[PDB]
Design a protein around this ligand. Structure first.
Ligand SMILES: NC(=O)c1ccc[n+]([C@@H]2O[C@H](COP(=O)([O-])OP(=O)(O)OC[C@H]3O[C@@H](n4cnc5c(N)ncnc54)[C@H](OP(=O)(O)O)[C@@H]3O)[C@@H](O)[C@H]2O)c1
Ligand SMILES: O=C(O)c1cc(Cl)cc(Cl)c1O
Ligand SMILES: [Zn+2]
Length: 318
């Protein structure tokens, strides 16, 4: 299926996640991405941060070349990293992703995370004592430069990631705004179901896109190892058994029935082909209510390296 974005464009409701932990070799992103396309995924999610935009581009372009899809059938997302928030650096960052990908445009370009870091080819820049080098950038200027990327045709749609209600408002209420964000891409799963923020995005015609929808990659030092493992949840497992599906497939269907566009990363061929079958079954309102009860305020990806600056998104209620 697909959802209609506030700019008239359409986004496939199931997306393929392409971030893998640093230990995972680049080559694996190319094979996985081709497997996802052959399985049925048409929405693909990457970012400069992931250091795979060459491999994913190769994967997409070979699937076009062999006639499996056409470019217009693929919805590809990239993201502007924190070291390029300054207005003059936004279009260069997009153009470089495009060069790496060897594509002419992205379907979606996001502000990745609202805290800015010092410009340069270090994605997490640190001083000689190991402390992060934060930059000072008006995100409204960042947005304005992202808008020009849309005018240019380099990005068909534009959006944000990891923005709270306050930062969404700053954007929507900004003088001379030309384009609303189509989406706010945020952590969302049955432990942390984002109800309050989901209702807010809905109210402004912004799609909630969920990442770490299967409980996150659990990469240290990014994710606390002592956090409960979402896909071990006994209710998701009882639901999996009732419907002859898995706990992952249940997690994913949850998001689709509540008006959320959902991402799923897997570099395992069996899991890739499995995840696209979210479309073959449904949950009752009673079972959706059951999964609502699983909320426990567990945020896997805090990005607390980036706590400190006023722009840190996760101090606010939502
Ligand atoms: N915007 C941001 O700041 C941000 C942050 C985090 C993530 N993202 C995006 O969202 C994507 C997904 O989030 P994520 O990478 O944290 O991973 P995730 O999709 O929540 O999945 C976590 C893990 O689940 C496993 N898995 C996949 N399908 C499964 C299945 N059917 N059964 C059991 N296990 C399964 C995968 O391992 P295998 O590979 O071994 O199958 C994967 O390591 C990322 O790749 C990235 O594209 C964006
Ligand atoms: O996938 C991401 O976008 C992502 C962003 C950040 Cl800031 C950190 C980690 Cl570990 C991620 O996986
Ligand atoms: Zn059922």
């Amino acid at each position: 299926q697909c959802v209609k974005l506030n700019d008239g464009h359409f986004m496939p409701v199931l997306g393929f996640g392409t971030y893998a932990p640093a230990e995972v070799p680049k080559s694996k992103a190319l094979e996985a991405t081709k497997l996802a396309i052959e399985a049925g995924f048409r929405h693909i999610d990457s970012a400069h941060l992931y250091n795979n935009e060459e491999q994913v581009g190769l994967a997409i372009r070979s699937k076009i070349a062999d006639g499996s899809v056409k470019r217009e059938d693929i919805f590809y997302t990239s993201k502007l990293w924190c070291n390029s928030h300054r207005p003059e650096l936004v279009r260069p960052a997009l153009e470089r992703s495009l060069k790496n990908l060897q594509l002419d445009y992205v379907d979606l370009y996001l502000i990745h995370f609202p805290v800015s870091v010092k410009p340069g080819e270090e994605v997490i820049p640190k001083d000689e004592n190991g402390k992060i080098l934060f930059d000072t950038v008006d995100l409204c200027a960042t947005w304005e430069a992202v808008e020009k990327c849309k005018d240019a045709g380099l990005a068909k749609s534009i959006g944000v990631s990891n923005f709270n209600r306050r930062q969404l408002e700053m954007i929507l209420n900004k003088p001379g705004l030309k384009y609303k964000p189509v989406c706010n891409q945020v952590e969302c799963h049955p432990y942390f179901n984002q109800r309050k923020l989901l209702d807010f995005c809905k109210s402004k015609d912004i799609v909630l896109v969920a990442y770490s929808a299967l409980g996150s990659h659990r990469e240290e030092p990014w994710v606390d190892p002592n956090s409960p493992v979402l896909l071990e949840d006994p209710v998701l497992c009882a639901l999996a058994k009732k419907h002859k599906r898995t706990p992952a497939l249940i997690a994913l269907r949850y998001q689709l029935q509540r008006g959320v566009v959902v991402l799923a990363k897997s570099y395992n061929e069996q899991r890739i082909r499995q995840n696209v079958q979210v479309f073959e079954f449904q949950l009752t309102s009673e079972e959706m209510k059951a999964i609502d009860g699983l909320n426990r305020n567990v945020r896997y990806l805090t990005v607390d390296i980036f706590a400190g600056p006023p722009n840190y998104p996760f101090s606010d209620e939502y």
